[PDB]
Amino acid sequence: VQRIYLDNNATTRIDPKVKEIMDPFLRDHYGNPSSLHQFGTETHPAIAEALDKLYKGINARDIDDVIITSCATESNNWVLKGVYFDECLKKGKNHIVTTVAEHPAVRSTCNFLESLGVEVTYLPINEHGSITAEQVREAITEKTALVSVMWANNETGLIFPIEEIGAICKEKGVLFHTDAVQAIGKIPVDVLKANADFLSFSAHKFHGPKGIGGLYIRSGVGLTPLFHGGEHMNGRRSGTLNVPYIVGMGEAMKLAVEHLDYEKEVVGKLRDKLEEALLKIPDVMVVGDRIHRVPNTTLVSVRGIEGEAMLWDLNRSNIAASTGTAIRLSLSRFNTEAEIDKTIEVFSQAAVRLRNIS
Amino acid sequence: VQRIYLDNNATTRIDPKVKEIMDPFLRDHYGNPSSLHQFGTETHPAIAEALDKLYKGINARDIDDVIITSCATESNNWVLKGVYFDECLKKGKNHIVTTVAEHPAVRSTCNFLESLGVEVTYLPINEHGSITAEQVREAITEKTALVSVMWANNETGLIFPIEEIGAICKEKGVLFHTDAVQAIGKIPVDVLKANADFLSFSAHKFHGPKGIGGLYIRSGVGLTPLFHGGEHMNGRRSGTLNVPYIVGMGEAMKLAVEHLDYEKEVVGKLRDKLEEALLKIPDVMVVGDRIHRVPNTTLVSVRGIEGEAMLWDLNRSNIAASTGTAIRLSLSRFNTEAEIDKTIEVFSQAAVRLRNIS
Ligand SMILES: Cc1ncc(COP(=O)(O)O)c(CN[C@@H](CS)C(=O)O)c1O
Ligand SMILES: Cc1ncc(COP(=O)(O)O)c(CN[C@@H](CS)C(=O)O)c1O
Ligand SMILES: [Cl-]
Ligand SMILES: [Cl-]
């Protein structure tokens, strides 16, 4: 059989060099990096190389932290529940601004925060699909503790004007968090450009394992731990390190940035190939702006066919993709022109076969 | 070279069958268990078998939850920060009772809670080393929201009278949490016997990977999420599942309980062998009760030699162990009588060589 994987915004295959690099930490280098003896200290260089990889990947400096967490869901909960205690309670700033596009980790967390009496402005998205920047200017009051906007959208692939929000954020002395989960490996990421205080990411969107991620915290910026016990990660996040995943996610980030050109000019080309080949059907609208998207995503709709129906069918022919109803097709560097040609065929055939019904 | 590993209360080697069982989830079964297509659904049986393994390991029933988390540090933070919102705030019960023996995850979390104005009673430990039970009877007031006592101590190996506390807890209508991290694989565990509402554990203490653990939540018992986004784990803990680690930790628990006899009557025998062979030196006190300990741990002290000094030396001869100052030696089923004989030698030689100094 030959299955075709087009659901990379949901998760990604672990790159072989990633699996390879973590292996020794699953086999004989199983010591606790906190231990003082050989088993512990032996793990130190490999963890250090991994972290360097992380910092170079997001252009973070020595004075900043990139804290290892168990996923972006953790990072997101941590940023919001931390500003809550640090700013909303202790400092009166009882308002957070965010978008309606944000991943449920941020939105649900907020929903809980307003449960406790925080006022949260959920920015609505325009006809362009995206968020303006001026929208956050206009919403930042002076109770405003944090603004959270995701770098790229998981559903549409749309890039948001981070930097702009970065600047409108610096100028107004407000805390700025970007959930950058769908941007690693997909476009260049730079916390310095973005004047981010906080950035989230998750490894399994750039070919490392599920079960690990990162929060960039800028120097001097405080954030009350979500995992108290303050032993690991400079006391910022307690719990025995996930050695294998740390090493692996490091390699993952490195390869992710080293493929940024390829993502740009190959996967993007394959995406365009698929997309415009798909636009030659009936009422095959693409959903949203088509210029400010990550290279790998396309979100198409179809005449009278539910997205859910088209996907179930595509599965039968061993093609994997998600909703977004419309149909989200998200590539990676592992896809091939052969596959998308195949996809074009299987897509169109499914399309007109599902519509036959009067 | 031949290193001897005696630091199992710090972390454990991943059992080979564990590494083996997770492998396919690092290679071609990398789908998101939430996806609706083949890549996702394919992972379902293996996750289900893993969870069954977890439930059978702690004698939890169908109506209870065993929620996957990223470690015991997460579980501990989750129980305490959840009762805070559910009971302390929303319901007036502003008091938590716990021990001074507890792992810093629980103690630090509490320290933060009293920072917000919770009254936390830290129970002191007796000359016996342990906690009475009557001590928690006497401390449970009516603002009392939760009592948290660890099943077994990481430092001394001492078992606490869970069940007794279970009963004193049922009777007084108080929420009962046991951190059981050092009890899995070491003695039988039973939430039913223990009348636990909450139980924490971490895989890397019973030969699975660092970076995963569990919280048992009893049916009908609520606990406000620590990871909001409510998609995975019945909305109780959001974040993409850590597929490989889940499968592995399942196998880990299974093998852990299947070795409970061996832990009892082999590793315990090896521990006794080491311990009484070590008691034949000078002022080689063992620290604490010696009857109510898990089979694998011994915590010995020495005349005038600092523990830290003895450990540094032991490392040079490739023997790994921790402090607890005194000296904690924690075995696993992977140790061998050959090793402990060797240890006896290397220990005594180090002892009298470090003391030579006038
Ligand atoms: C922007 C963003 N932020 C957070 C997450 C979740 O990360 P975790 O590693 O699961 O915690 C995701 C992943 N959303 C996937 C799976 S639910 C999708 O199908 O769109 C994301 O895209
Ligand atoms: C009772 C108990 N509770 C929690 C933990 C920490 O679990 P994590 O998986 O790191 O979150 C531990 C592990 N304490 C180790 C390493 S710090 C020791 O050397 O004693 C524990 O023993
Ligand atoms: Cl918190
Ligand atoms: Cl919480």
PDB file of C-alpha atoms in Angstrom, chain B residues 19-30:
ATOM      1  CA  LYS B  19      11.894   0.847  24.596  1.00  0.00           C
ATOM      2  CA  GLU B  20      10.814  -1.901  22.204  1.00  0.00           C
ATOM      3  CA  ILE B  21       7.104  -1.266  22.600  1.00  0.00           C
ATOM      4  CA  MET B  22       7.368   2.503  22.058  1.00  0.00           C
ATOM      5  CA  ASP B  23       9.625   2.222  19.012  1.00  0.00           C
ATOM      6  CA  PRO B  24       6.845   1.900  16.329  1.00  0.00           C
ATOM      7  CA  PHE B  25       5.257   5.124  17.592  1.00  0.00           C
ATOM      8  CA  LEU B  26       8.582   6.969  17.020  1.00  0.00           C
ATOM      9  CA  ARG B  27       8.794   5.449  13.451  1.00  0.00           C
ATOM     10  CA  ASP B  28       5.686   4.996  11.283  1.00  0.00           C
ATOM     11  CA  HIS B  29       2.669   5.356  13.598  1.00  0.00           C
ATOM     12  CA  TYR B  30       3.096   9.047  14.189  1.00  0.00           C
TER      13      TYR B  30
END
